[PDB]
Amino acid sequence: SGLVPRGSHMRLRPLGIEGVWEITPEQRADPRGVFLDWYHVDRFAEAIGRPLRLAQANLSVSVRGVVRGIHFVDVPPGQAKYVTCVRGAVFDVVVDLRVGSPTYGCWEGTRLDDVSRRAVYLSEGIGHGFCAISDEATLCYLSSGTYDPATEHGVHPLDPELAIDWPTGTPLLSPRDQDALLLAEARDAGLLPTYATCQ
Amino acid sequence: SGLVPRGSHMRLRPLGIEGVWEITPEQRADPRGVFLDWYHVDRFAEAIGRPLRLAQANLSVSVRGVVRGIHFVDVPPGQAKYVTCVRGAVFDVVVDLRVGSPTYGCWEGTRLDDVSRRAVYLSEGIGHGFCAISDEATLCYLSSGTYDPATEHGVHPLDPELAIDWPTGTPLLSPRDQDALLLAEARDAGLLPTYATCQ
Prior knowledge:
homodimer, dTDP-4-dehydrorhamnose 3,5-epimerase activity (chains A, B), 41% strand, six-stranded antiparallel beta sheet, globular, mainly beta
């Protein structure tokens, strides 16, 4: 049969960082395949408070060991993201970059794969990164704003305050992420979102 | 390197059925992976006339030879869909079911795969189906309305007026699609959308 995934009803539950939710899809399987609902406006708008504004949809394909992140968008205008792994498996990480937040400088990892097919929603001011666990992995992202190079920034994914437990011994970083500021450096230059503003 | 896909700017071009467009993504590749924009609200709203309303997002995984379709939603309220193949390859088919349309009872097939990573947008009253070409294939769909069992209907994918050239000798149909009405039967019972209404 190959691996046959678990049947499920949709659920939306908060993670440990305010403004971040994990979505369990509505999923069924039969001998011809698998079908799932991974976003539903009525379920989402009730839980989060408003429908997701679709401004852009993206895909990324990454090889095993690639660590990408921690990326965020300035607030204002902010950007929210709804992320899922459509092929393979990733260790997905959200980072609270909102100065003043109770969970500022905390992170949380979620396994996003093509078996459970969970999604993560992250609100404005939240940073995002991931590590491909599978030999290659494909993420699909729905974003509430379009790409603007003036507002997209990042912090170093090997930052020592975060000390993220990436599931690879040899993280493959792009020049952009290798050269990114430490969290404290970004903070010290006034580059991070403020929790009051994101609220 | 594995297969390295073509770099591209986004394009939206009309197919042969009014209300149906093919989207070429903005895509880049480097040694760590592939990144693409497969929906962009400014590009889309300019071409189609309005931003895509995100009501539901779905995924389907199908084995080779599975033919699914031809499905549509009653108008009103209608439903528009934005479809792409995120893994594998499918022969994707749109069918003009709008009585009175110049292209009523015509179809058009597009290869949606994980190499070119094109998307198809189909407006209200347009039917949709596909055949998995790869051993398994994963489609991702963004829809402007949520699932309502009262409004989702179909016609037989082996209908003789359409005579769709499915790239399999042995189409695997679900009981639902095996039992679906012929196009002329649906028409004769008043079950099809009207072009004036969709307009």
